[PDB]
Amino acid sequence: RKEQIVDCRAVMGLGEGGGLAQRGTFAEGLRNDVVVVAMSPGRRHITKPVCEITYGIREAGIQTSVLVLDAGGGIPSDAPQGSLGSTFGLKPEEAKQVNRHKLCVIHFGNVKSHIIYKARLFLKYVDIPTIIVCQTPVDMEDFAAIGIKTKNVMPLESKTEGKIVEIITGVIRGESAPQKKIDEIIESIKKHLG
Amino acid sequence: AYTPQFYPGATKVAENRRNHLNPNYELEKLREIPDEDVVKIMGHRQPGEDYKTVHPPLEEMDFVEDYARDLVEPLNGAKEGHRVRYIQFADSMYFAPAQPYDRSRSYMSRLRGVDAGTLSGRQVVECRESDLEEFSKNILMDTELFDPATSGMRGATVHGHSLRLDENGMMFDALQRCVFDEKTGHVMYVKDQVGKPLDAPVDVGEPIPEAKLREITTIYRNDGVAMRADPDVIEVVKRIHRARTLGGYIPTNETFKGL
Amino acid sequence: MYQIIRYEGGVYKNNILKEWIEDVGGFIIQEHVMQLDVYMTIAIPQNEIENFKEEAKKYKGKIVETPLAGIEIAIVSPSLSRHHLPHIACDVSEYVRKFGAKPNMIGLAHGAGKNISEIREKEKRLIQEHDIAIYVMGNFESCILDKTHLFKVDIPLVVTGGPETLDIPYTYVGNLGRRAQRLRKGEEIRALRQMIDEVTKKINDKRMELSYDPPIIPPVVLKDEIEKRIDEVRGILAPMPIVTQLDGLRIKMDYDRNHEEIENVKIGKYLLKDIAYVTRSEMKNYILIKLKSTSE
Amino acid sequence: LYNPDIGVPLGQRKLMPYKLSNTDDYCEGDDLHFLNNAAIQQLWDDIRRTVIVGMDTAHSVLEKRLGVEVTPETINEYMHTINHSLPGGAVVQ
Amino acid sequence: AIGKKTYQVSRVPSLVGRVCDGGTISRWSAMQIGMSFITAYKLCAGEAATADFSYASKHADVIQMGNALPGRRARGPNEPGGIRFGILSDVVQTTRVSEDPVEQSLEVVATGAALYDQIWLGAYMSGGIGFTQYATASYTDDILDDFSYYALDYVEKKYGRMGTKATMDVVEDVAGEVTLYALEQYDDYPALLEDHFGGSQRAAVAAAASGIGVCMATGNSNAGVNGWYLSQILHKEYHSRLGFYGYDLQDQCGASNSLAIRNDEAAPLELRGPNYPNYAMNVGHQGEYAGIAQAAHSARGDAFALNPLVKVAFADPMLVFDFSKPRKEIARGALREFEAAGERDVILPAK
Amino acid sequence: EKRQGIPLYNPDIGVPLGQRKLMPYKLSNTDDYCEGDDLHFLNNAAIQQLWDDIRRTVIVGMDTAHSVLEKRLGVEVTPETINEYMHTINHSLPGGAVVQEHMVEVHPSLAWDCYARIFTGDDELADELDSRFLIDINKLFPEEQAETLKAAIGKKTYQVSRVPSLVGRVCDGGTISRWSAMQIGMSFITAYKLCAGEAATADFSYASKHADVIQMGNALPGRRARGPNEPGGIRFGILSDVVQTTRVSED
Amino acid sequence: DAFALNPLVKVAFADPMLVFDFSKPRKEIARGALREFEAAGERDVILPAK
Amino acid sequence: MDYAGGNIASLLGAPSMMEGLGYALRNIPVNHAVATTKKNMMNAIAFSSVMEQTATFEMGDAVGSFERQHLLGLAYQGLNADNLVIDFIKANAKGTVGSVVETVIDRAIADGVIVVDKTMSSGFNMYKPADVNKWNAYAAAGLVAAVAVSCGAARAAQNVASVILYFNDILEYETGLPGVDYGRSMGTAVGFSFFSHSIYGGGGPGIFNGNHVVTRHSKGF
Amino acid sequence: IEIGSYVRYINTGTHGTVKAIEPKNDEEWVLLENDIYYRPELLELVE
Amino acid sequence: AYIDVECNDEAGKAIYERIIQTSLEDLVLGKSIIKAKMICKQDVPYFIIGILPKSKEDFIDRVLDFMNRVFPEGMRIRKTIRDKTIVMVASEKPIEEEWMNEAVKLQEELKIFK
Numbered sequence A: 001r002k003e004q005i006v007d008c009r010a011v012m013g014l015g016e017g018g019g020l021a022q023r024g025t026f027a028e029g030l031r032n033d034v035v036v037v038a039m040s041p042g043r044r045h046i047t048k049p050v051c052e053i054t055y056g057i058r059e060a061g062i063q064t065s066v067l068v069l070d071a072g073g074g075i076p077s078d079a080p081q082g083s084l085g086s087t088f089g090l091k092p093e094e095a096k097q098v099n100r101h102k103l104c105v106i107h108f109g110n111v112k113s114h115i116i117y118k119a120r121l122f123l124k125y126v127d128i129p130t131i132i133v134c135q136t137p138v139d140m141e142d143f144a145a146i147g148i149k150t151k152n153v154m155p156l157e158s159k160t161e162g163k164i165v166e167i168i169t170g171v172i173r174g175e176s177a178p179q180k181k182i183d184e185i186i187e188s189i190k191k192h193l194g
Numbered sequence B: 001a002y003t004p005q006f007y008p009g010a011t012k013v014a015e016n017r018r019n020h021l022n023p024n025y026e027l028e029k030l031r032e033i034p035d036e037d038v039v040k041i042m043g044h045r046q047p048g049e050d051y052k053t054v055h056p057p058l059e060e061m062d063f064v065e066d067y068a069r070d071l072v073e074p075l076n077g078a079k080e081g082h083r084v085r086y087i088q089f090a091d092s093m094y095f096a097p098a099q100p101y102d103r104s105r106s107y108m109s110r111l112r113g114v115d116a117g118t119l120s121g122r123q124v125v126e127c128r129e130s131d132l133e134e135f136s137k138n139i140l141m142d143t144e145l146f147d148p149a150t151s152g153m154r155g156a157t158v159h160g161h162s163l164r165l166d167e168n169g170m171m172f173d174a175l176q177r178c179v180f181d182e183k184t185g186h187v188m189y190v191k192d193q194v195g196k197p198l199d200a201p202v203d204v205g206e207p208i209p210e211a212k213l214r215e216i217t218t219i220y221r222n223d224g225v226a227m228r229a230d231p232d233v234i235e236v237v238k239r240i241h242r243a244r245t246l247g248g249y250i251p252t253n254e255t256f257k258g259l
Numbered sequence C: 001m002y003q004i005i006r007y008e009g010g011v012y013k014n015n016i017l018k019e020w021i022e023d024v025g026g027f028i029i030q031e032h033v034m035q036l037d038v039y040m041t042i043a044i045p046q047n048e049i050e051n052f053k054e055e056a057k058k059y060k061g062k063i064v065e066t067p068l069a070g071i072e073i074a075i076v077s078p079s080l081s082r083h084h085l086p087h088i089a090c091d092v093s094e095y096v097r098k099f100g101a102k103p104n105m106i107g108l109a110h111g112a113g114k115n116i117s118e119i120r121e122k123e124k125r126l127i128q129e130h131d132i133a134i135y136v137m138g139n140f141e142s143c144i145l146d147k148t149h150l151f152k153v154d155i156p157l158v159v160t161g162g163p164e165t166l167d168i169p170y171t172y173v174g175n176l177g178r179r180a181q182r183l184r185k186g187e188e189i190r191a192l193r194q195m196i197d198e199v200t201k202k203i204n205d206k207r208m209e210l211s212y213d214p215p216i217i218p219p220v221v222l223k224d225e226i227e228k229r230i231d232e233v234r235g236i237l238a239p240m241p242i243v244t245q246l247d248g249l250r251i252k253m254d255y256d257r258n259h260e261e262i263e264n265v266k267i268g269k270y271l272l273k274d275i276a277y278v279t280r281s282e283m284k285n286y287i288l289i290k291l292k293s294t295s296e
Numbered sequence D: 001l002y003n004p005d006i007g008v009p010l011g012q013r014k015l016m017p018y019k020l021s022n023t024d025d026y027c028e029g030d031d032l033h034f035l036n037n038a039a040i041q042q043l044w045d046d047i048r049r050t051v052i053v054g055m056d057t058a059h060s061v062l063e064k065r066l067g068v069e070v071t072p073e074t075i076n077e078y079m080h081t082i083n084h085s086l087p088g089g090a091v092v093q
Numbered sequence E: 001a002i003g004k005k006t007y008q009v010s011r012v013p014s015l016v017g018r019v020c021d022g023g024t025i026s027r028w029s030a031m032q033i034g035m036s037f038i039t040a041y042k043l044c045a046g047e048a049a050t051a052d053f054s055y056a057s058k059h060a061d062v063i064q065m066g067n068a069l070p071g072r073r074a075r076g077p078n079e080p081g082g083i084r085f086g087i088l089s090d091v092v093q094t095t096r097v098s099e100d101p102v103e104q105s106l107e108v109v110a111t112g113a114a115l116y117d118q119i120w121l122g123a124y125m126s127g128g129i130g131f132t133q134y135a136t137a138s139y140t141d142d143i144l145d146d147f148s149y150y151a152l153d154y155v156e157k158k159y160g161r162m163g164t165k166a167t168m169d170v171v172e173d174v175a176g177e178v179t180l181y182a183l184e185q186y187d188d189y190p191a192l193l194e195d196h197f198g199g200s201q202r203a204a205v206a207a208a209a210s211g212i213g214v215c216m217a218t219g220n221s222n223a224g225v226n227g228w229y230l231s232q233i234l235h236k237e238y239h240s241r242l243g244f245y246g247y248d249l250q251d252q253c254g255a256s257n258s259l260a261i262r263n264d265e266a267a268p269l270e271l272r273g274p275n276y277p278n279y280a281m282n283v284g285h286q287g288e289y290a291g292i293a294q295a296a297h298s299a300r301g302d303a304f305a306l307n308p309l310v311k312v313a314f315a316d317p318m319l320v321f322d323f324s325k326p327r328k329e330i331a332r333g334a335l336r337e338f339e340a341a342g343e344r345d346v347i348l349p350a351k
Numbered sequence F: 001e002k003r004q005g006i007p008l009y010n011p012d013i014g015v016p017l018g019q020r021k022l023m024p025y026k027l028s029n030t031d032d033y034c035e036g037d038d039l040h041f042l043n044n045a046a047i048q049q050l051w052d053d054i055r056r057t058v059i060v061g062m063d064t065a066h067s068v069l070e071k072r073l074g075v076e077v078t079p080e081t082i083n084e085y086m087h088t089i090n091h092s093l094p095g096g097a098v099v100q101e102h103m104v105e106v107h108p109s110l111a112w113d114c115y116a117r118i119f120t121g122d123d124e125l126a127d128e129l130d131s132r133f134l135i136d137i138n139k140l141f142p143e144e145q146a147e148t149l150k151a152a153i154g155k156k157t158y159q160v161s162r163v164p165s166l167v168g169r170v171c172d173g174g175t176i177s178r179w180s181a182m183q184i185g186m187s188f189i190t191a192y193k194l195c196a197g198e199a200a201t202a203d204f205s206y207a208s209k210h211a212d213v214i215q216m217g218n219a220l221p222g223r224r225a226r227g228p229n230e231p232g233g234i235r236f237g238i239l240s241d242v243v244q245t246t247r248v249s250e251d
Numbered sequence G: 001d002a003f004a005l006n007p008l009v010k011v012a013f014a015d016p017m018l019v020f021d022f023s024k025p026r027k028e029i030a031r032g033a034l035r036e037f038e039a040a041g042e043r044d045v046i047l048p049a050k
Numbered sequence H: 001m002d003y004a005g006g007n008i009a010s011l012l013g014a015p016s017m018m019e020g021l022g023y024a025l026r027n028i029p030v031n032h033a034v035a036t037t038k039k040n041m042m043n044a045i046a047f048s049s050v051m052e053q054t055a056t057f058e059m060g061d062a063v064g065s066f067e068r069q070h071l072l073g074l075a076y077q078g079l080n081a082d083n084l085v086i087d088f089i090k091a092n093a094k095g096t097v098g099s100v101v102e103t104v105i106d107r108a109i110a111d112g113v114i115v116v117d118k119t120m121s122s123g124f125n126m127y128k129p130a131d132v133n134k135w136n137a138y139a140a141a142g143l144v145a146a147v148a149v150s151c152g153a154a155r156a157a158q159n160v161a162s163v164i165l166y167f168n169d170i171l172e173y174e175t176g177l178p179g180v181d182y183g184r185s186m187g188t189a190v191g192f193s194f195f196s197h198s199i200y201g202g203g204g205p206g207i208f209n210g211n212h213v214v215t216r217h218s219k220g221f
Numbered sequence I: 001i002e003i004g005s006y007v008r009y010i011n012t013g014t015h016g017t018v019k020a021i022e023p024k025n026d027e028e029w030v031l032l033e034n035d036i037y038y039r040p041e042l043l044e045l046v047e
Numbered sequence J: 001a002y003i004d005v006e007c008n009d010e011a012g013k014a015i016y017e018r019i020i021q022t023s024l025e026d027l028v029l030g031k032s033i034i035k036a037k038m039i040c041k042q043d044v045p046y047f048i049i050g051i052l053p054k055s056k057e058d059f060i061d062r063v064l065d066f067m068n069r070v071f072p073e074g075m076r077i078r079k080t081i082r083d084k085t086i087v088m089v090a091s092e093k094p095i096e097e098e099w100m101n102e103a104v105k106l107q108e109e110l111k112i113f114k
């Protein structure tokens, strides 16, 4: 039980009856322990799967920061045969804001082939241990098949400087996350933070 | 004979549409993109290697004797026998020099054996690969039909024809095939038209200035030239609509007396 | 003399408008580009209001009058748990942001409960470091009435609560309690507008009180001078690296490594240490600046 | 300076809520899909389940083929019966 | 219009139409009508007069919302492909609660979009994403509202609500003016253009406004669709783009088929529907066609468009969906505050 | 509460029910009893789901599509590419839009019953494919039945699309084929990066969603006018093949 | 015989992912009669709880 | 109610499986007509035109004031009346679709079918038909010739939709005159475009027949 | 577990042969045919 | 689900009714619960929430999550009774026996709810 102060963003949200967060914005929780990364300020990512994880971390006693990615939708351009639909990417300032935290929690989606290259590009610039929160069951070996550092399944040629420390499956975008998933996230953060 | 007019109107937009439709009008060229660079942006074949074939050459295949079919001279790519490829363009509503229906009409008026398709934010022309590369270099890319900022050779994800331009005056691209190089002031294609990255970026030239874009565009805009300033085009459109209505009602000469 | 407004236009030819703002002496306080539109909080001289409006309508931009874009607000939620954080508190914070103010979420360590509630002195002084504090309370009359000791600061205060009318000796805005939904109904929007009106009135009274004896230098041009001199201000990863307060600034650097650089800044012909109170901030060991008036 | 790992933001307007015409309600685009909107489904359901039958030939069949007089009391009794039978209540058998 | 005749409105449960198809409804109502007739008048449980009752309730005196579509369409009755535009105009009850003709036309536009484009085209003949942004472009912001109010103002300034007889010249004048205004508003406001980013959306909205204006000028529905088609082909020359390729099939043959008299081509717009041969493929037309059909009668201040029985039956306050304000009901359903029928929670285990 | 005084169910009017003993009903080969009202299809969710699962099933073959991809489109078809396509269609069939966050999508919990499965008579393709979305003939059937079914099917690959039940609830039975065909075409042009504006894509669309489509029921003509995948169009042999008792019983 | 009319229909409905398992049709009708059958197609996430 | 899995076939489908009433004769696809005529151009055109216009007579469309236009369309499009199709193809051996449009306008002016209506301020003398049905027949013959010229240049049958669509578009905005079938040919060309050029499409142009919802709109043109 | 043995992954079922054992950071790691390190506690011996 | 709140605060009643409705909607629990009655005693801080479920342990975990969502922050000392009707009392003080007697009264009055 201690005081928890958040440096709020400087930009207003999406209109009047819309989301409260804005794309490409960072909200510092003073003391930098856990940063929660959201792909977009839309209803698929904000307050249904992300702010719930955020309040679970804040209820566990760990100060939390929420960063909304500027371009979090789609696949990176280094995916096979280029990108389609939209291009996923990370800004250097976003990577610097993530890298000052002890741990990262990132929320991914459905398709297995999208998540692996998204995590590879994210960990090409992020060097802290991150927890991947997705919906479909991805095994923590398919990331090593494309060269991602990983606690249990290392690659021979590691193309990332950050390590996936836990995969948590069963969190749907735009839906209320149950207490059991929050408890798994809290236990993983406590076991891999101190 | 008959001297062909191409489009009604007195404004600069109607004049540009007439110039695009005219096959005897030489389009002003504004850049030099080499043939292998156009092939590389097109992304269909490796430059320097032979064209892939879909059938033997027309001399080798035996057809039935047809007098009417043999009157038409085939294309060279049809003579050798080449696969039919495509080149796709997106055109911004903010004073792009070429526009989709204008592009399709000019292609079908100027080129032989082409397959033109028109969408709101898309325009594609299909032809045999050698001839398609020839008119892609000669007409589609280097002339005043193309602007590397307000237009772009892009397949796959197309979006941004109705969106506002970016800080460099370029059309929005979700895949970012072409970027702006501020050191040279030129637009460089870092990906091909479908999205895989290029090993060497290719200079398609610098953006056309907006003052020239006002003169060479084929779109009507309130901030540019509106159709209210061109009553001749509206009258022709209304005459076409009335003639269609009268023909659909009763297609006789007495019903067309009220035209 | 420096009216602060928000510009919402496009990124196309936005650099030319920024050059015009720099030419007329304006200062860009905040810039954010989402995809193709830019939100720009600009402080321009009052004699250029109509010229900037004509310039903005040339680029099809929008001028939004923001009455709170010179202050920072502390929003004191009882905790950062699921009860108060993910709704109401962000609704209040984003509504405050919509009128230009820079908010800070203050989650009390022991702010929950009816009789077990307490407020620490460190949290107290962090609240006093802001210009105005907004308390987001619950929806029971007796609970808040037995919780007056939380609102014990010499700062302008607006208390938001569930009951329509409360008998506390502070400014109170009703129909904003603890909820679990996004504030979107008409009564909720009306109550948010009411809270905005009360904080606007308090800020205007404090602005008149400051205008009775003006400071040596306005905070906006002091922030501009600090960004011109200190070259480490562009390396700050915080949301707002320099927060313009009502009568000062909050520079988000380490106090121990940067206070001697901040104090030895020559503005006009004056040194900063003789004209401002450079002190350590309770918020993440930052630097807080409090301006002196012309009387001293 | 060209970094292909920056990414391109897309769909800023499509993240903002949609107003509804002549109302004051703002909603997300995902809630306007007919599968996600129960009101659109009920709008089609109410049209689909509506059948109008003229009860004038039936009264004539009752009157002149069966010799049964039709009064508003009998019509009220019929309405009471059919409000039980149409949901699926049992009247004979 | 009804006369001294008595009618019965049978509303079967929504669960019945959810488990089964739309052809179930008339048969369900017919068996229950026959059962209630034989047990309320104490008749024999099965005789020749019972067959007379069954034949009457099955065809002779039945009124279906939609016709059956056998053959290629392969669909039963009470399907959204069989619902004519006048029938859907009479379903919406904005006429009896409001005097604004533009609002009456636009609620029918919204209902027709949400039915035809979102359901009948979104899922019945397509799948997956469907056409949400194609249809919501007609009822989300007041773009179509502003365009239609400009059309009404322009018509009332120079013609009046019924001040002119339907001729070619008034159709050309009104449709051209409204199309030019709508495209000028798209040019002047980048927010409007970015909202209606697809060309089909813009074309449908501008042409719907032009057709509504022509209907508010003449009161003729077929002149309204003629104005719609002129607006489409004038949009095509303004912006050198109309929509996705596949959109303007019916817009090209429209002018010829709008006032035609041939068997496959002639039908009044109230009697037209999604099974009209030109209209049986494409999104962005049918819901606005229903609104133009309504606007033909809103200019005259008519109580109904095609069927008075449908109007009276859907004026029933016991309906789950409120047809007086379809847009408010859609907004309620988008915010998880609409209580819908057809659910089965009493026969399901607790999750 | 809801009806504001309008009568709905009146057991007093009509037949006086219960003059004889209303017997319960057993269910054959099961040791449980129920009332007769529980066996009504409106009161029984299991019968509704029995019809729902049949209505929402479309079987499409992917051998002409693979041949068109290999030859006419010049795209290699590997088991890895088939796994990628299966992931794409499993995301896209319920309501999903692949890498398009701006697109309106159906809520995923609203379509939890939606699956896209694959099976093949080719054994090495079967063990080279992912078992997450594979209907394995060898482990679901006895050895002689599996051999007979593999001989009858051949060396061909088929995909089973289970359209979500709510789609069949809101719409009719003929909706299912269009839904499955549209999502199969979208997932094929997404997983294999193909141009969607050429005639070769039209030929591939025919090969992928109009060449080997197996529907559960046919359309019905005349006064019984109905679309496909309605229970009047289901032949007796098709329904016999729907029930799987030969798998688990020899009686 | 392994099948009656269509081998493809026989293999397709052997899928364990089906909510209604067609191996024992009598047993599941019993489960739906005792209100212990979890059916699909319920719009519980887009409806109010009151 | 069909012959699906059998081994007996006819050129006509089931009468209950028609798009509209009287649509029985528009069931022969393009490929059947081409194979019956042994891949001969003019004979396949004549076969398709004879079936389509006889079907329009069956539909009741070519009754009264439309009979002359359908007879002229049949004669000039399918049977090469006055050698118009062959003359346009010979004149545009090296040409494009726009050159075919120019030759059609020149022939219609020379034969007196169309005359100048009025000249606008910006030039562009408008054209009106002195004989409406004859102008429709001339435009239909030119449409066939334009398709032949473009598809003989490309030697590929994928160009049909674009050629018909933009032939009608170029002719309309070149003369101010209506196109073939007063826009119905252009609408059917849009149908051909979305049916044979997309993943929303299905099949190629060889399976085009008038008993389909996509292709039924033009009455044999 | 040694070179030439047949091993499987419990989480997915990836068949492969052991290439080498390369300890690092005082921890045991197993290198397989696909050039991917694995953990011995997550590997089992099959025959 | 039937929702009612017993409280002497006029605004707090409606606000906590909306809170219970939102927590039932978020966990998708509105159809699996027949009645949800909450008794708000704020003069002496103690709150009782009673749940009457329709007709496994995952459902009980979801119901406990629902109580955690509805119950206020400071009421941390909690004790629940489950005999097919789940009733929990939350307070900032140790739970008194009179509060438990009121909990059993609520449980018994929810048992006969039909």
Ligand code: F43
Binding pocket: D089, D090, D091, D092, D093, E031, E032, E035, E045, E046
């Ligand atoms: C009024 C009819 C005429 C008609 O078209 N259908 C009736 C009634 C109808 C109604 C019953 C309405 C209600 O519940 O009051 C329904 C359900 C059809 C419907 N969808 O409305 C029905 N019968 Ni019938 N009907 C049935 C049966 C039967 C058997 C009853 C055998 C006997 O004991 O005499 C006889 C046929 C006979 O001539 O033998 C029968 C007749 C009749 N059946 C005769 C006369 C009934 C009478 O008792 O006065 N049903 C049965 O044999 C069992 C199945 C049962 C059906 C419902 C179910 O499956 O639960 C029901 C099916």
Ligand code: F43
Binding pocket: B119, B120, B121, B122, B155, B156, B157, B158, B159, B160, B161, B162, E126, E127, E128, E129, E130, E131, E132, E133, E134, E135, E197, E198, E199, E200, E201, E243, E244, E245, F096, F097, F098, F100, F103, F104, F182, F186, F189, F195, F196, F197, H199
């Ligand atoms: C992405 C595609 C690929 C394709 O085959 N069709 C697409 C996508 C497809 C999918 C989207 C789902 C997915 O996973 O792909 C569906 C739903 C097809 C359907 N069943 O109706 C759709 N489009 Ni499209 N599509 C739309 C639209 C549009 C507009 C977008 C204009 C722009 O420049 O941004 C344009 C058509 C045009 O050019 O006029 C468009 C194109 C395209 N559309 C092209 C563009 C790229 C291509 O060349 O391959 N859509 C719109 O204009 C809005 C309505 C929207 C439809 C869904 C909705 O109503 O919610 C969707 C309708």
Ligand SMILES: C[C@H](OP(=O)(O)O)[C@H](NC(=O)/C=C\CCCCSSCCS(=O)(=O)O)C(=O)O
Binding pocket: B119, E121, E125, E126, E243, E244, E245, E246, E279, E280, E281, E282, H194, H198, H200, H201, H213
């Ligand atoms: C729905 C219609 O049939 P119906 O109107 O008779 O019911 C149905 N139409 C189709 O199948 C065809 C094409 C629809 C797709 C258009 C979606 S618009 S979004 C991308 C389109 S484009 O970019 O390629 O232009 C048919 O089978 O004819």
